[PDB]
């Protein structure tokens, strides 16, 4: 099932096809259509990005703190689950969520959705653990926030689609571009953007990836961005979504994790490689 | 019913009487007898402690790291859950559990127990946070480990009895001594012990506690140790059990958490005042 993807629109397995949650198998046996108005991956269709209009990044969550404001972002998996980075956890006094807004100032002051629990991967490697044990800092940089009450969906608030490991591996990451967004700062060490910014960044090959980094790029991450073109994610963007489009449908593929500066020559942004954490996600989500 | 505990062996609810998990109330409505052979608390009956004989610290758990071996201890609550300190979590690459063993060497070389989930208290304050938001370091130093597979209990391996906030506040914590153990260092900055050590440590008055150190213990902690007698817990003992005896049964009352050095003059060990976290524990054990 590597030649045309078995002709499946989404997921294939030898062949038999299937779709992401909230999609129905076409009358042909290969197609996938949205079986509801709140199906995942449906859209209105950071350094040097464009404003993500309302409803253009519905899966974009906002982690908010009284003193710090919006320190990170996330991605809506379902009504009561939100994916983010583990290193966004326990770095501020409080923490709550906000979805459906693209205006930074409005998010902060506005009301806030409460957080119930929070799952952090057990093998997450915080900078300190890295130096002491010589491990790759920010390895397994994945986490999931469970809301206390279900999130209300709309055409501006809907979850991103979760891919199959195989699918995300053979099709998604073999695509040309991916979308990244966040309320992070617009310039290395620069100011936080007042708006939700969005950006397209190309998958970079493993080798080019590792060789251009001062620190190890483990099998659980992947890099994206441009060699010299000054576009990239930045601080505050952590936890933010990295999705790939495939047939008018967005799937989650990465998580803003780490980087050496922001948009530097010959260097890229690092991302958690979800194709390695599908079972980890599925376990939690199904409970 | 704070009048001698209603003449009841375990828990007294105002009078109504009961017992710890795995115990049975007598016909007199006061006594508590062991329901089974693996009933909690039941026994064979660190600076300058003694070698805890096998079967004398049956609830003692050993937290094991690939490259660093035993770095902390824990306390068995049930076949599935082991109690420990939060600061023992995510401070090492891997974390496995080993029980029914008192030899440090054999534990590191032998077969380990796999850890499934780990519940770290949401309000725990690491040195990191305590400097940033002026909070009390090691406040809420508590965490629960959930094994992949049920632990096999035996003479050498059994859990400590979880008490009620009241019982622990009105009876246990009014006792003269507690018992504590671990595989930690035998002396400040010194080498870790070769074998499990066990120590009796007297309960200290919260006042003599605030007066002794630059670092005040929060209301979620309590201190225990000696003024000038070189007996205390030490690094590597964290997570270990602080148990209090009542009617030949062992109740968990504290957790080895912190302290200024080990066995210093006019200073005592700090322990997670477990009676503050009983409902917290009960929720997760459901």
């Amino acid at each position: 099932c590597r030649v045309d993807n078995g002709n499946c629109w989404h997921f294939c397995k030898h062949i038999q096809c299937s779709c992401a949650e909230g999609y129905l198998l076409g009358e042909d046996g290969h197609s996938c259509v949205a079986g509801g108005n709140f199906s995942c991956g449906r859209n209105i269709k950071i350094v040097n990005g464009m404003d993500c209009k309302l409803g253009e990044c519905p899966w974009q969550a906002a982690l908010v703190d009284e003193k710090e404001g919006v320190f990170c972002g996330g991605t809506i998996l379902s009504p009561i689950y939100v994916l983010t980075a583990a290193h966004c956890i326990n770095e501020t006094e409080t923490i709550s969520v906000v979805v459906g807004e693209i205006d930074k100032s409005r998010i902060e002051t506005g009301p806030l959705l409460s957080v119930d629990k929070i799952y952090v991967h057990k093998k997450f490697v915080p900078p300190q653990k890295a130096y002491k044990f010589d491990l790759a800092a920010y390895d397994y940089d994945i986490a999931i926030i469970q809301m206390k009450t279900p999130i209300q969906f709309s055409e501006n608030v809907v979850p991103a689609c979760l891919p199959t490991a195989d699918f995300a591996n053979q099709v998604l990451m073999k695509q040309d571009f991916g979308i990244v967004s966040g309320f992070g700062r617009i310039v290395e060490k620069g100011p936080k953007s007042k708006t939700l910014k969005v950006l397209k960044v190309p998958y970079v090959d493993r080798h080019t990836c590792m060789v251009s980094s001062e620190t190890p790029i483990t099998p659980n991450m992947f890099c994206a961005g441009y060699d010299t073109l000054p576009r990239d994610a930045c601080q505050g963007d952590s936890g933010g979504p990295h999705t790939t489009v495939y047939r008018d449908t967005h799937f989650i593929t990465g998580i803003v994790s780490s980087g050496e500066g922001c948009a530097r020559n010959g260097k890229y942004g690092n991302y958690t490689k979800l194709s390695k954490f599908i079972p980890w996600i599925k376990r939690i989500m199904r409970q | 019913c704070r009048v001698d505990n209603g003449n009841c062996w375990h828990f007294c609810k105002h009078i109504q009487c009961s017992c710890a998990e795995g115990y049975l109330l007598g016909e007199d409505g006061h006594s508590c007898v062991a329901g089974g052979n693996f009933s909690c608390g039941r026994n064979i009956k660190i600076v300058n402690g003694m070698d805890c004989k096998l079967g004398e610290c049956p609830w003692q758990a050993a937290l094991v790291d690939e490259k660093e071996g035993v770095f902390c201890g824990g306390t068995i609550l049930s076949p599935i859950y082991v109690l420990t300190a939060a600061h023992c979590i995510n401070e090492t690459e891997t974390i496995s559990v080993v029980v029914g063993e008192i030899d440090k060497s054999r534990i590191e070389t032998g077969p380990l127990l796999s850890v499934d989930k780990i519940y770290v208290h949401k309000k725990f304050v690491p040195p990191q946070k305590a400097y940033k938001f002026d909070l009390a370091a090691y406040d809420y130093d508590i965490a629960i480990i959930q094994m992949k597979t049920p632990i096999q209990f035996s003479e050498n391996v059994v859990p400590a009895c979880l008490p009620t906030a009241d019982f622990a506040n009105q009876v246990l914590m009014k006792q003269d001594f507690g018992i504590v153990s671990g595989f930690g260092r035998i002396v400040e900055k010194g080498p870790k012990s070769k074998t499990l050590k066990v120590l009796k440590v007297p309960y200290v008055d919260r006042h003599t506690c605030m007066v002794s150190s630059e670092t005040p213990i929060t209301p979620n902690m309590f201190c225990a140790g000696y003024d000038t007698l070189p007996r205390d817990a030490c690094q590597g003992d964290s997570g270990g059990p602080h148990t209090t005896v009542y009617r030949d049964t062992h109740f968990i009352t504290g957790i080895v958490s912190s302290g200024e050095g080990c066995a210093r003059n006019g200073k005592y060990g700090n322990y997670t005042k477990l009676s503050k976290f009983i409902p917290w524990i009960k929720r997760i054990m459901r």
Partner: peptide
């Protein structure tokens, strides 16, 4: 609320 962070 279990007032906890779970590590899976």
């Amino acid at each position: 609320d279990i007032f906890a962070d779970i590590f899976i």
